[PDB]
């Protein structure tokens, strides 16, 4: 008794007290303001609800035995909100239930009472007018069964609850699709519900039916409106296709909503990562660099761990495919050094023109590269090693025998050396010529690049950039000023005094 | 007081990075710790170094000595409030700050120093506080502390001449500059051989002369190496007692490239294990070698690589590989032909080199300014 | 010793003499101005980020 008579009940009351101002007070504030008069895009409760969900991810971790936090769902389900005195009475009844839980034991909904949470929306004299509130309460109740899924084959209950929530969402899409107030307040809620359903399906289900449902929902959208709903669904569909090995490029290249121009810097990173991955896997490297750099630079700055790992790894791999990447880890993190050491060896072998080191590292870390899902994009790189070796040996020498070329590239055959050199010459890699009868290669030397036109272009690009940035800055200039109607010149009644003084001076 | 403490740091390093060097310094460092009733070094030294399982008695007795001294100083404070001079409590806590800094850890010393900085109305005492802060920063390698204290000291020394304090600050600033990879300013600031080296705290004069010649070989060129480091009377008088360094300088200057390599190898061995040169001891070497290569080819036009074999160091293949790997880097502008083993020279214009630097600085500044631009406005 | 810039040829013992243009003084000022601008941009962080 002494062990839990002061610390265990406190854990129940402290989490309950926190949930009093976390969901009950926050729910009341949203009902009176966000769900009351009106709620704009920057709703004080929508961001608050998102932050509350993110915090609740690390606020409650146990199954909430003895209704420490599980009875909060029973407490939030015992709400009427039908009339102002009726809402006060419902709040008082919830307070009485909390007092009883302080005195007696409430329902211990810890892996044993999740089923009885289905008729609650139809009970306790609930008010169904606030459809977004019901959707949010269902997503939060789904999260309580989806916070950790309780493992041990308990994802079936979460899937059933998600199916019920999806049926409710389909009803909301059916009930006033014009959204008098159906979607205008639940669009973010609908996106979050779709994301949670996709997460549950990826956890313990199949995504084929989820993909069909998402495609149908997206088709239903993009006709009434084309904002805030055409991005998360598209990202989920792209992720579902990325799980398999489909084309994944026909759908992305026909949709005009990939650039909604309003993503809150959230879906843009995922869209850019998917587009860059597809472009790199589609034998195109020039275009994907800008997109993936934008993706990396649009990522959240604080505590995004797993995400910038894979994207930065792919960025350095594809930049090696292009052939220049010195700086990659100048922002070392405690979970960043371990996951990037093997690729270091790769680039260290890649930078030199030798190819034996390429095999020496590949035959060692092939399994690790396969486990990271980049083996198919890492075996097509030996040509770049040969190219950089030829370029280096052309820069260094001017008149060199082909046998030495073969020896210093260890191509194992001098006959293929002339073919490789010719192929390099043909695409404009080098400007040298070889004499078959003699054998040596006579490099062509021509230097005077300042007289060439190209510096002009190399400056034009940056000049245009610097001219654009200023304009953007001045375009974001006068947004914060507002309500400056105050316009007073000198005074109100001083004109009469001045006129009187002038008349007095004139009279004298 | 931090007048004798600097050497301790070196010994610490001599046990950390050198893998096999763990037998000599382990006894005299522990002797310096058992003296002065130290407690600061071995909160973590015992963890990093040997376990020293038989230690509890020394720990307890040193702790008890620490509380004895602290209690005596506090009772002096208490006696001092009732009849104060220049608020004699504040001079008393200034006296306690040295002991707390020497025996205790950083935070207590910093708090005591920041508390006692508000007493002194004389400028010299404030300068002494700043010098203690700078010495602590050098001891524990705190970049922000060093920068802030250096700028504060430079601002404060403007009032009143105090040319001695200026020379001391110049020596401190030179040590900080040579700590990072900045040799130009280090060799510039090390022109105090004749303007006094009274800062015997950090090191002795002979080490100062060796450091200044080592950095003068990097920073400056022949028309100044012939005017300041080879003509100085005092530096030559000191160097006369050091045959190795004099040989190492004359070999480079008199164009005896054969004997240059032995001195270069010995010097780099010496500075690999040396403090504040180890983390980049390689880079220094990678200059001198290539520097010598650039000091021979600029007179002739078609020198063969055969001559370099007996004139610069044996091994034609070694010279070939070094020349190739330095050509590929973009510096040491020349060319080599291997079918007949002939080295040719060229003279690129000083406008190409003065253009990629502009473009790369512009790129870096553009990246930084774009990051700054989109940090704000969410 | 840089008091006379030319080149020497050992094959025929021939002293080739050539002149070079003076170094352009426009660039280095721009380089150090760019460095000063970098310092200013660095200083703007403490004014901007400390409340955002």
């Amino acid at each position: 008794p002494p062990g839990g008579g002061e610390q265990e009940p406190p854990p129940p009351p402290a989490p309950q007290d926190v949930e009093m101002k976390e969901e009950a007070a926050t729910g009341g504030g949203s009902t009176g303001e966000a769900d009351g008069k009106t709620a704009a895009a920057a709703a004080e409760h929508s961001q608050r609800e998102l932050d509350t969900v993110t915090l609740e991810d690390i606020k409650e971790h146990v199954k909430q035995l003895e209704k420490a936090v599980s009875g909060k769902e029973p407490r939030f389900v015992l709400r009427a909100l039908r009339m102002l005195p009726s809402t006060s009475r419902r709040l008082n009844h919830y307070v009485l239930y909390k007092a009883v839980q302080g005195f007696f034991t409430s329902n211990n909904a810890t892996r044993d009472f999740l089923l009885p949470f289905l008729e609650e929306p139809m009970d306790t004299e609930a008010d169904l007018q606030f459809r977004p509130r019901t959707g949010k309460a269902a997503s939060t109740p789904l999260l309580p069964e989806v916070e950790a899924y309780l493992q041990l084959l308990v994802v079936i209950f979460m899937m059933n609850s998600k199916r019920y929530k999806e049926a409710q969402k389909i009803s909301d899409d059916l009930m006033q699709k014009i959204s008098t107030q159906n979607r205008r307040a639940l669009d973010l809620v609908a996106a979050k519900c779709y994301y949670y359903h996709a997460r549950v399906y990826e956890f313990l289900d199949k995504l084929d039916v989820v993909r069909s449902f998402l495609h149908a929902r997206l088709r239903t959208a993009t006709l009434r409106h084309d904002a805030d709903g055409q991005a998360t669904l598209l990202n989920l569909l792209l992720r579902n296709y990325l799980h398999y090995s489909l084309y994944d490029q026909a759908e992305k290249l026909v949709s005009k909503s990939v650039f909604p121009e309003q993503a809150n810097n959230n879906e843009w990173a995922r869209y850019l990562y998917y587009t860059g991955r597809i472009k790199a896997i589609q034998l195109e490297y020039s275009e994907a660099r800008r997109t993936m750099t934008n993706a990396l630079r649009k990522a959240p700055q604080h505590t995004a761990v797993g995400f910038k790992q894979t994207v930065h790894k792919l960025l350095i791999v594809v930049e090696l495919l292009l052939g220049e990447i010195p700086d990659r880890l100048q922002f070392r993190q405690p979970s960043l050094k371990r996951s990037l050491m093997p690729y270091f060896l790769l680039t260290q072998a890649v930078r030199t023109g030798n190819l034996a080191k390429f095999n020496q590292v590949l035959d060692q870390f092939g399994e690790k590269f396969q486990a990271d899902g980049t083996y198919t994009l890492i075996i097509r790189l030996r040509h770049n090693v040969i190219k950089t070796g030829v370029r280096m040996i052309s820069l260094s020498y001017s008149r060199i025998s082909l046998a030495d070329i073969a020896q210093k590239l260890q191509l194992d055959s001098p006959e293929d050396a002339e073919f490789i050199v010719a192929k390099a010459i043909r695409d404009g890699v080098i400007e040298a010529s070889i004499n078959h009868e003699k054998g040596y290669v006579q490099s062509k030397e021509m230097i005077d690049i300042y007289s060439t036109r190209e510096p002009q272009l190399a400056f034009h690009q940056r000049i245009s950039f610097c001219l654009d940035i200023h304009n953007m800055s001045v375009k974001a200039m006068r947004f914060p000023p507002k309500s400056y109607n105050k316009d007073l010149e000198s005074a109100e009644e001083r004109r009469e005094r001045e006129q009187q003084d002038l008349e007095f001076a004139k009279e004298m | 007081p931090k007048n004798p403490d600097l050497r301790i740091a070196q010994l610490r390093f001599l046990l950390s990075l050198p893998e096999h060097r763990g037998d000599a310094a382990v006894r005299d460092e522990l002797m310096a710790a058992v003296r002065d009733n130290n407690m600061a070094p071995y909160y973590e030294a015992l963890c990093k170094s040997l376990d020293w399982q038989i230690d509890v008695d020394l720990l307890n007795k040193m702790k008890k000595a620490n509380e004895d001294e602290l209690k005596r100083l506090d009772e002096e404070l208490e006696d001092a409030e009732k009849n104060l001079g220049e608020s004699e409590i504040r001079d008393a806590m200034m006296a306690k700050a040295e002991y707390l800094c020497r025996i205790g850890d950083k935070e207590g010393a910093l708090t005591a120093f920041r508390k006692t900085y508000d007493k002194t109305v004389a400028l010299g005492h404030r300068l002494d506080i700043v010098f203690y802060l700078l010495r602590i920063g050098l001891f524990y390698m705190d970049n922000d502390l060093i920068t802030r204290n250096t700028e504060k000291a430079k601002s404060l020394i403007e009032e009143g001449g105090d040319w001695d304090r200026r020379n001391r600050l110049k020596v401190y600033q030179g040590l900080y500059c040579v700590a990072i990879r900045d040799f130009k300013q280090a060799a510039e600031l090390f022109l105090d051989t004749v303007s006094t080296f009274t800062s015997y705290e950090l090191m002795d004069y002979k080490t100062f002369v060796t450091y200044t010649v080592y950095v003068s070989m990097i920073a400056l060129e022949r028309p100044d190496l012939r005017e300041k480091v080879i003509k100085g009377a005092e530096i030559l008088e000191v160097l006369h007692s050091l045959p190795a360094v004099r040989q190492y300088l004359f070999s480079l200057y008199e164009c005896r490239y054969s004997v240059f390599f032995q001195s270069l190898a010995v010097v780099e061995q010496e500075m690999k294990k040396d403090w504040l040169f180890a983390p980049h001891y390689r880079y220094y070497v990678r200059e001198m070698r290539i520097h010598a290569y650039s000091q021979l080819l600029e007179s002739y036009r078609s020198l063969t690589l055969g001559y370099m074999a007996e004139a610069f160091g044996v091994g034609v293949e070694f010279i070939d590989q070094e020349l190739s790997r330095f050509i590929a880097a973009g510096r040491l502008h020349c060319k080599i032909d291997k079918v007949n083993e002939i080295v040719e020279t060229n003279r690129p214009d000083s406008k190409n080199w003065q253009y990629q630097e502009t473009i790369k600085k512009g790129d870096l500044l553009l990246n930084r300014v774009q990051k700054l631009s989109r940090v704000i406005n969410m | 010793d840089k008091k006379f810039h030319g080149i020497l040829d050992q094959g025929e013992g021939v002293l080739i003499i050539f002149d070079e243009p003076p170094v352009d003084k426009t660039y280095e000022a721009a380089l150090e101005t760019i460095q000063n601008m970098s310092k200013v941009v660095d200083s703007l962080y403490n004014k901007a980020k400390k409340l955002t």
Binding site: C466, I469, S473, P481 | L366, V369 | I34, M37, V41
Partner: peptide, 30 residues
């Protein structure tokens, strides 16, 4: 090129100044 860079820096400084000076005006109304 250099002049454009300077103009961009000045524009960023002006934006920072305006935003900082104006964000501290809503709370004075209570």
């Amino acid at each position: 090129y250099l002049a454009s860079l300077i103009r961009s820096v000045v524009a960023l400084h002006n934006l920072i100044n305006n935003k900082i000076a104006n964000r501290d005006a809503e709370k004075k109304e209570g």
